[PDB]
Amino acid sequence: SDTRYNKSFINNKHLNEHAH
């Protein structure tokens, strides 16, 4: 919960490649 120069691992791997 403190990765400013990362942004939560690139927005959660781009939402796991767009998959809800």
PDB file of N, CA and C in Angstrom:
ATOM      1  N   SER A   1       0.806  -1.255   0.000  1.00  0.00           N
ATOM      2  CA  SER A   1       0.000   0.000   0.000  1.00  0.00           C
ATOM      3  C   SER A   1       0.846   1.318   0.000  1.00  0.00           C
ATOM      4  N   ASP A   2       2.015   1.310  -0.672  1.00  0.00           N
ATOM      5  CA  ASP A   2       2.909   2.483  -0.808  1.00  0.00           C
ATOM      6  C   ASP A   2       3.868   2.211  -2.010  1.00  0.00           C
ATOM      7  N   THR A   3       3.318   2.276  -3.238  1.00  0.00           N
ATOM      8  CA  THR A   3       4.039   2.099  -4.502  1.00  0.00           C
ATOM      9  C   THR A   3       3.547   3.256  -5.417  1.00  0.00           C
ATOM     10  N   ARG A   4       4.092   4.447  -5.135  1.00  0.00           N
ATOM     11  CA  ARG A   4       3.811   5.688  -5.903  1.00  0.00           C
ATOM     12  C   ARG A   4       4.483   5.649  -7.296  1.00  0.00           C
ATOM     13  N   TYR A   5       5.776   5.259  -7.364  1.00  0.00           N
ATOM     14  CA  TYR A   5       6.510   5.117  -8.652  1.00  0.00           C
ATOM     15  C   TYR A   5       6.274   3.718  -9.359  1.00  0.00           C
ATOM     16  N   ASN A   6       5.090   3.127  -9.106  1.00  0.00           N
ATOM     17  CA  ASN A   6       4.602   1.835  -9.616  1.00  0.00           C
ATOM     18  C   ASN A   6       3.075   1.855  -9.926  1.00  0.00           C
ATOM     19  N   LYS A   7       2.239   2.547  -9.111  1.00  0.00           N
ATOM     20  CA  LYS A   7       0.770   2.696  -9.307  1.00  0.00           C
ATOM     21  C   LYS A   7       0.061   1.322  -9.114  1.00  0.00           C
ATOM     22  N   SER A   8       0.192   0.679  -7.915  1.00  0.00           N
ATOM     23  CA  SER A   8      -0.423  -0.648  -7.604  1.00  0.00           C
ATOM     24  C   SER A   8      -0.133  -1.736  -8.706  1.00  0.00           C
ATOM     25  N   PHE A   9       1.162  -1.937  -9.085  1.00  0.00           N
ATOM     26  CA  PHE A   9       1.605  -2.916 -10.118  1.00  0.00           C
ATOM     27  C   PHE A   9       0.976  -2.668 -11.532  1.00  0.00           C
ATOM     28  N   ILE A  10       0.995  -1.394 -12.022  1.00  0.00           N
ATOM     29  CA  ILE A  10       0.434  -0.979 -13.349  1.00  0.00           C
ATOM     30  C   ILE A  10      -1.123  -1.218 -13.310  1.00  0.00           C
ATOM     31  N   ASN A  11      -1.912  -0.560 -12.398  1.00  0.00           N
ATOM     32  CA  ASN A  11      -3.396  -0.738 -12.286  1.00  0.00           C
ATOM     33  C   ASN A  11      -3.825  -2.248 -12.241  1.00  0.00           C
ATOM     34  N   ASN A  12      -3.195  -3.070 -11.348  1.00  0.00           N
ATOM     35  CA  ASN A  12      -3.475  -4.529 -11.195  1.00  0.00           C
ATOM     36  C   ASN A  12      -3.230  -5.294 -12.535  1.00  0.00           C
ATOM     37  N   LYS A  13      -2.049  -5.110 -13.204  1.00  0.00           N
ATOM     38  CA  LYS A  13      -1.717  -5.769 -14.514  1.00  0.00           C
ATOM     39  C   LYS A  13      -2.818  -5.386 -15.570  1.00  0.00           C
ATOM     40  N   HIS A  14      -3.240  -4.082 -15.636  1.00  0.00           N
ATOM     41  CA  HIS A  14      -4.301  -3.583 -16.561  1.00  0.00           C
ATOM     42  C   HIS A  14      -5.624  -4.377 -16.273  1.00  0.00           C
ATOM     43  N   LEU A  15      -6.035  -4.539 -14.969  1.00  0.00           N
ATOM     44  CA  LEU A  15      -7.257  -5.309 -14.573  1.00  0.00           C
ATOM     45  C   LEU A  15      -7.098  -6.791 -15.078  1.00  0.00           C
ATOM     46  N   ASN A  16      -5.880  -7.416 -14.935  1.00  0.00           N
ATOM     47  CA  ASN A  16      -5.583  -8.802 -15.401  1.00  0.00           C
ATOM     48  C   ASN A  16      -5.923  -8.907 -16.938  1.00  0.00           C
ATOM     49  N   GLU A  17      -5.495  -7.888 -17.747  1.00  0.00           N
ATOM     50  CA  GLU A  17      -5.749  -7.809 -19.213  1.00  0.00           C
ATOM     51  C   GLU A  17      -7.288  -7.694 -19.521  1.00  0.00           C
ATOM     52  N   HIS A  18      -8.031  -6.823 -18.773  1.00  0.00           N
ATOM     53  CA  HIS A  18      -9.492  -6.589 -18.925  1.00  0.00           C
ATOM     54  C   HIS A  18     -10.341  -7.886 -18.746  1.00  0.00           C
ATOM     55  N   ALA A  19     -10.574  -8.270 -17.475  1.00  0.00           N
ATOM     56  CA  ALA A  19     -11.354  -9.471 -17.112  1.00  0.00           C
ATOM     57  C   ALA A  19     -11.853  -9.295 -15.655  1.00  0.00           C
ATOM     58  N   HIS A  20     -13.152  -8.968 -15.503  1.00  0.00           N
ATOM     59  CA  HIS A  20     -13.797  -8.759 -14.181  1.00  0.00           C
ATOM     60  C   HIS A  20     -14.089 -10.108 -13.451  1.00  0.00           C
TER      61      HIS A  20
END
